[PDB]
Enzyme design. Structure first.
Site, PDB file in Angstrom:
ATOM      1  N   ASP A 143       0.869  -1.165   0.000  1.00 30.85           N
ATOM      2  CA  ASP A 143       0.000   0.000   0.000  1.00 30.85           C
ATOM      3  C   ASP A 143       0.900   1.206   0.000  1.00 30.85           C
ATOM      4  O   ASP A 143       0.894   2.026  -0.908  1.00 30.85           O
ATOM      5  CB  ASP A 143      -0.786   0.024   1.307  1.00 30.85           C
ATOM      6  CG  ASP A 143      -2.160   0.598   1.211  1.00 30.85           C
ATOM      7  OD1 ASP A 143      -2.320   1.708   0.687  1.00 30.85           O
ATOM      8  OD2 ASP A 143      -3.087  -0.065   1.704  1.00 30.85           O
ATOM      9  N   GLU A 165      -0.772  -1.655   7.896  1.00 33.86           N
ATOM     10  CA  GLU A 165      -1.151  -1.585   9.248  1.00 33.86           C
ATOM     11  C   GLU A 165      -2.650  -1.598   9.296  1.00 33.86           C
ATOM     12  O   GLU A 165      -3.314  -0.773   8.652  1.00 33.86           O
ATOM     13  CB  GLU A 165      -0.571  -0.358   9.944  1.00 33.86           C
ATOM     14  CG  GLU A 165      -0.815  -0.354  11.441  1.00 33.86           C
ATOM     15  CD  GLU A 165      -0.223  -1.575  12.123  1.00 33.86           C
ATOM     16  OE1 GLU A 165      -0.894  -2.637  12.194  1.00 33.86           O
ATOM     17  OE2 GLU A 165       0.919  -1.501  12.619  1.00 33.86           O
ATOM     18  N   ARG A 175       2.535  12.119   3.493  1.00 29.02           N
ATOM     19  CA  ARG A 175       2.361  10.968   2.693  1.00 29.02           C
ATOM     20  C   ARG A 175       1.270  11.221   1.683  1.00 29.02           C
ATOM     21  O   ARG A 175       0.280  11.916   1.983  1.00 29.02           O
ATOM     22  CB  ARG A 175       2.183   9.690   3.568  1.00 29.02           C
ATOM     23  CG  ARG A 175       1.105   9.750   4.641  1.00 29.02           C
ATOM     24  CD  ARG A 175      -0.269   9.476   4.092  1.00 29.02           C
ATOM     25  NE  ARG A 175      -1.307   9.638   5.122  1.00 29.02           N
ATOM     26  CZ  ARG A 175      -2.290   8.763   5.395  1.00 29.02           C
ATOM     27  NH1 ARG A 175      -2.216   7.506   4.977  1.00 29.02           N
ATOM     28  NH2 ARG A 175      -3.315   9.143   6.147  1.00 29.02           N
ATOM     29  N   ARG A 212       0.352   6.092  -0.338  1.00 31.74           N
ATOM     30  CA  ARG A 212      -0.398   4.953   0.087  1.00 31.74           C
ATOM     31  C   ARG A 212      -1.594   4.915  -0.869  1.00 31.74           C
ATOM     32  O   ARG A 212      -1.947   5.972  -1.453  1.00 31.74           O
ATOM     33  CB  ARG A 212      -0.828   5.107   1.553  1.00 31.74           C
ATOM     34  CG  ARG A 212      -0.849   3.796   2.348  1.00 31.74           C
ATOM     35  CD  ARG A 212      -1.514   4.005   3.690  1.00 31.74           C
ATOM     36  NE  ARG A 212      -1.593   2.802   4.548  1.00 31.74           N
ATOM     37  CZ  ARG A 212      -2.759   2.190   4.881  1.00 31.74           C
ATOM     38  NH1 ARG A 212      -3.831   2.333   4.130  1.00 31.74           N
ATOM     39  NH2 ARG A 212      -2.824   1.374   5.924  1.00 31.74           N
ATOM     40  N   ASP A 250      -6.578  -0.488   2.243  1.00 29.15           N
ATOM     41  CA  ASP A 250      -5.989  -0.533   3.570  1.00 29.15           C
ATOM     42  C   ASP A 250      -5.364  -1.896   3.740  1.00 29.15           C
ATOM     43  O   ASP A 250      -6.088  -2.908   3.851  1.00 29.15           O
ATOM     44  CB  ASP A 250      -7.057  -0.314   4.644  1.00 29.15           C
ATOM     45  CG  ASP A 250      -6.475   0.126   5.982  1.00 29.15           C
ATOM     46  OD1 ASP A 250      -5.492   0.899   6.000  1.00 29.15           O
ATOM     47  OD2 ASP A 250      -7.003  -0.272   7.047  1.00 29.15           O
ATOM     48  N   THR A 251      -4.052  -1.936   3.720  1.00 35.58           N
ATOM     49  CA  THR A 251      -3.329  -3.203   3.736  1.00 35.58           C
ATOM     50  C   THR A 251      -2.313  -3.387   4.921  1.00 35.58           C
ATOM     51  O   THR A 251      -2.489  -4.286   5.746  1.00 35.58           O
ATOM     52  CB  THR A 251      -2.543  -3.346   2.423  1.00 35.58           C
ATOM     53  OG1 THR A 251      -3.320  -2.850   1.346  1.00 35.58           O
ATOM     54  CG2 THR A 251      -2.188  -4.789   2.159  1.00 35.58           C
TER      55      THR A 251
END
EC number: 3.1.31.1
Lengths: 121, 35
Positions: free
Chosen positions: A21, A43, A87, A35, A40-41
């Site tokens: 991600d 964490e 990010r 990201r 959502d990968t």
């Protein structure tokens, strides 16, 4: 393209793929850790199964799709291009193959719930 | 609900992701086999 307005996609240079991600790309000379929007990968919100992330495969999986690609495109949504943590938030396409799609379709990631209450609330 | 909150209507691409998600959910693929 579903929407009448086609969103802004621009090519970027792949620096490294950290997670499945969270990856680092350089767009127009700007190196940022991105990201993948709607994904959502790495964490988990809270790893409930523990092995709910599938990190080893997921992080390798992204490397497969991005490193085999000649053309890497970062497409930004109507949300934001950048987040306060420094990010980036983007959809990564490998010659038009949306890596985000591959992750969720492979069951390596969940769609990240961007929240629409109803309207304004 | 969801115990999550965002204001912006980001629907763009959700349907693309979620068809692909739905396919995998029913397939119990990796994470979807958490259930």
């Amino acid at each position: 393209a579903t929407s009448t307005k086609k969103l802004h996609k621009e090519p970027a240079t792949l620096i490294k793929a950290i997670d499945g991600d969270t990856v680092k790309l350089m767009y127009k000379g700007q190196p940022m850790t991105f990201r993948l929007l709607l994904v959502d990968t790495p964490e988990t919100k809270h790893p409930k199964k523990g092995v709910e992330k599938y990190g080893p495969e997921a992080s390798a999986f992204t490397k497969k799709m991005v490193e085999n690609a000649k053309k890497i495109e970062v497409e930004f949504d109507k949300g934001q291009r950048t987040d306060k943590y420094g990010r980036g938030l983007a959809y990564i396409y490998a010659d038009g193959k949306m890596v985000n799609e591959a992750l969720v379709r492979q069951g390596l990631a969940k769609v990240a719930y961007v929240y629409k209450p109803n309207n304004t609330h | 609900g969801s115990v999550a909150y965002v204001y912006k209507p980001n629907n763009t691409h959700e349907q693309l992701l979620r068809k692909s998600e739905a396919q995998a959910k029913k397939e119990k693929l990796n994470i979807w086999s958490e259930d």
